[PDB]
């Protein structure tokens, strides 16, 4: 058939993607012989090293560039160049990444418990959210103060309140408050010591 310079039968479409979501640029390229295809970002070629995790493919005249977990550092101008003996074509689009947010959420909540005097007690919670939540523990509404008796500890999203030796004076309503720019969540439990 006829030799033909590269042409985009379907151009790249600019896209606004949510952080962490998958982003996909796709285009349909025609031409004969089949053109050589190459992707670029701000005037520089894209590859698995330039943009790790990037999946690039070109089959059945369909060129696709997929970024699994999109980051804010990926937005910008992306372009696709197609070339053969008859000429060269380029299609450029912009990637806009929208900041992701989630209110504080208790994956693991506080649980009420009744124990006998002198028992070692641990109250835990696991909290998630974006931005990272600020977590504080309360006993009957007053912020718990760290000591050998009451111990607040954190490891990632897991917060714990350890009462090494629980006595009747420690009974009460225990709660945890978690906040971030998009919301506030609270968890409450009853601790009873005989």
UniProtKB/Swiss-Prot annotation:
May I ask which residue range the UniProt record assigns to the signal sequence?
A: none
Compartment(s) where it occurs, according to its Swiss-Prot or TrEMBL record: Cytoplasm; Nucleus
Question: What the entry says about post-translational processing?
Answer: Autophosphorylated.
Write out the tissue specificity statement of the associated record. Isoforms 3, 7 and 8 are expressed in cardiac muscle. Isoform 4 is expressed in vertebrate skeletal muscle. Isoform 6 is expressed in skeletal muscle (at protein level).
Instruction: Give start and end of each Ig-like domain.
Output: 6-96, 104-192
The linked condition is: Myopathy, myofibrillar, 9, with early respiratory failure: An autosomal dominant myopathy characterized by adulthood onset of weakness in proximal, distal, axial and respiratory muscles. Pelvic girdle weakness, foot drop and neck weakness are the main symptoms at onset, but ultimately the weakness usually involves the proximal compartment of both upper and lower limbs. Additional features include variable degrees of Achilles tendon contractures, spinal rigidity and muscle hypertrophy. Respiratory involvement often leads to requirement for non-invasive ventilation support.
**UniProt domain comment:** ZIS1 and ZIS5 regions contain multiple SPXR consensus sites for ERK- and CDK-like protein kinases as well as multiple SP motifs. ZIS1 could adopt a closed conformation which would block the TCAP-binding site. The PEVK region may serve as an entropic spring of a chain of structural folds and may also be an interaction site to other myofilament proteins to form interfilament connectivity in the sarcomere.
User: Any extra detail in the entry?
Assistant: In some isoforms, after the PEVK repeat region there is a long PEVK duplicated region. On account of this region, it has been very difficult to sequence the whole protein. The length of this region (ranging from 183 to 2174 residues), may be a key elastic element of titin.
UniProt record similarity statement: Belongs to the protein kinase superfamily. CAMK Ser/Thr protein kinase family.
Q: What does this protein do?
A: Key component in the assembly and functioning of vertebrate striated muscles. By providing connections at the level of individual microfilaments, it contributes to the fine balance of forces between the two halves of the sarcomere. The size and extensibility of the cross-links are the main determinants of sarcomere extensibility properties of muscle. In non-muscle cells, seems to play a role in chromosome condensation and chromosome segregation during mitosis. Might link the lamina network to chromatin or nuclear actin, or both during interphase.
Subunit note: Interacts with MYOM1, MYOM2, tropomyosin and myosin. Interacts with actin, primarily via the PEVK domains and with MYPN. Interacts with FHL2, NEB, CRYAB, LMNA/lamin-A and LMNB/lamin-B. Interacts with TCAP/telethonin and/or ANK1 isoform Mu17/ank1.5, via the first two N-terminal immunoglobulin domains. Interacts with TRIM63 and TRIM55, through several domains including immunoglobulin domains 141 and 142. Interacts with ANKRD1, ANKRD2 and ANKRD23, via the region between immunoglobulin domains 77 and 78 and interacts with CAPN3, via immunoglobulin domain 79.
Put simply, this protein is called Titin
Q: Which organism is it from?
A: Homo sapiens
Q: What fragment of the whole protein does this chain represent?
A: 1 to 194 of 34350
């Amino acid at each position: 058939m006829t030799t033909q310079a590269p042409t985009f039968t379907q151009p790249l479409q600019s896209v606004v993607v949510l952080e962490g979501s998958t982003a996909t640029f796709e285009a349909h390229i025609s031409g004969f012989p089949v053109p050589e295809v190459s992707w670029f970002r701000d005037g520089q070629v894209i590859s698995t090293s330039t943009l790790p995790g990037v999946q690039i493919s070109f089959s059945d005249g369909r060129a696709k560039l997929t970024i699994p977990a999109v980051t804010k550092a990926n937005s910008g101008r992306y372009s696709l160049k197609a070339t053969n003996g008859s000429g060269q074509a380029t299609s450029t689009a912009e990637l806009l990444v929208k900041a992701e947010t989630a209110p504080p959420n208790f994956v693991q909540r506080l649980q009420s418990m009744t124990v006998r005097q002198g028992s070692q007690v641990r109250l835990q919670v696991r909290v998630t959210g974006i931005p990272t939540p600020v977590v504080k523990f309360y006993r009957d509404g007053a912020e718990i103060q760290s000591s050998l008796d009451f111990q607040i500890s954190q490891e990632g999203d897991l917060y714990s309140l350890l009462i090494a030796e629980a006595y009747p004076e420690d009974s009460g309503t225990y709660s945890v408050n978690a906040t971030n720019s998009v919301g506030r969540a609270t968890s409450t439990a009853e601790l009873l010591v005989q």
